[model samples]
Target: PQITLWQRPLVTIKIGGQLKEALLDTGADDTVLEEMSLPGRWKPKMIGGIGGFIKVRQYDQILIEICGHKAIGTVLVGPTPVNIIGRNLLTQIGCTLNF
Candidate 1:
């Protein structure tokens, strides 16, 4: 069976360290995790969105495995701001762009 995002990856990430699967999407540009989901000290940074600027923090670098690929980087270790698999990581995967 083929694995699409809707099938291969689970939409919502498990809060606790239980499972090990993440969705990879080129549409996302920034890596974001939620503040409440993480357990550590974080520094605030300026973030821009559709509305305006918001205060956010650079989260943690967790080990993730997807489709035989593995990476250790900032994984927005919080609740669920926008659990994204942004461009920064996608570029490293070496997938051909469809468009």
Candidate 2:
């Protein structure tokens, strides 16, 4: 895919049987999802961002189906506006930001 700075990038992710939209932070790290319940253990964390840092719940090895590829990834749960997809999980889905 051609990288575009003119607009924000987004991706389709699976949660249950439904498809959810997510933003691509390709210059990215940390898959941040809005606060929600996930069946598994999580640890307390504070991730850094342009807005400084945010305290979030870090869940490792969570199932993530991006676009069509499925993989296990670490996820952050907190009070976020929209789901953010980072390079960590995106890499496993054969994702890359192009020139």
Candidate 3:
């Protein structure tokens, strides 16, 4: 789907069987979700954003569903103001930036 820069591309995404709202961020390199109870072993990692650095749990091979489109990739669980659907997942959904 095509979206403009001025538009806040908020979409519903299902992660680990739980549905949640997330922002489509073309600028982000990796997907980041609000802290949740995710199964499996994850390694502790830190990421830097506009707000600074944050501690996150890196979970690989997670199943993510966006608008019925499904993709398996890595997801970062952390304390974020909003869930972010980064390029990692966006590409799978065929997201395009339109002026």
Candidate 4:
């Protein structure tokens, strides 16, 4: 059950307030959430993994849908510059990793 990571164009959304278009990546480890471009009241909780803790604050519970598939989860505001399409969508859809 292998799934291929495709560089597809996706929409980046802020759970609390902001939303934008970003690239989609199915091979990513976790959901790479972003924050409002300007100053805002978005405070995401801290998130961590094997690589280390990812910068996080607080997010509103939300649903990010893609390719007709949907996932109900929390969005974490990360310090990283890029957004990602991670396991949140793929795992729920039972998608295989191609690589």
Candidate 4, which ten residues in sequence have the lowest lDDT sum?
1-10
Give Cα distance to truth, residue 3, candidate 2, Å.
6.4
**Predicted candidate 3: what Cα RMSD to the true structure?**
1.4
Q: Tell me which residue pairs clash in candidate 1.
A: 33-76, 34-78, 34-79
Model 3 Cα displacement at 71 (Å)? Answer: 0.6
Question: Where is model 2 more than 4 Å wrong at Cα?
Answer: 1-5, 16-18
- Which portions of model 3 show Cα errors greater than 4 Å? none
Model 3 earns a TM-score of 0.90
TM-score of each: 0.54, 0.86, 0.90, 0.52
What does candidate 1's lDDT look like per residue over 10-69, in tens digits? 333443454444555565565665454554556666656666666667665554444445
Residue-level lDDT of model 4, residues 4-91, one tens digit each, is 3454456544333445554455556556656543333456455655567766654444566645455655455567566665666557
Model 1 CA deviation exceeding 4 Å by range: 1-27, 39-41, 77-81
**Candidate whose TM-score is highest:** 3
Which stretches in model 4 have alpha-carbon errors above 4 Å? Answer: 1-27, 37-54, 58-60
Best by lDDT: 3
Superposed on all Cα atoms, the candidates' RMSDs to the truth, in angstroms, are 4.4, 1.8, 1.4, 5.3
- Which whole-number lDDT from 0 to 100 does residue 69 have in model 3? 95
Residue range 28-96, candidate 2, lDDT tens digits: 688999877776888999887678888889888888888778888898889877899888887887777
User: Native-vs-model 4 lDDT?
Assistant: 0.54
lDDT of each candidate versus the true structure: 0.52, 0.81, 0.88, 0.54
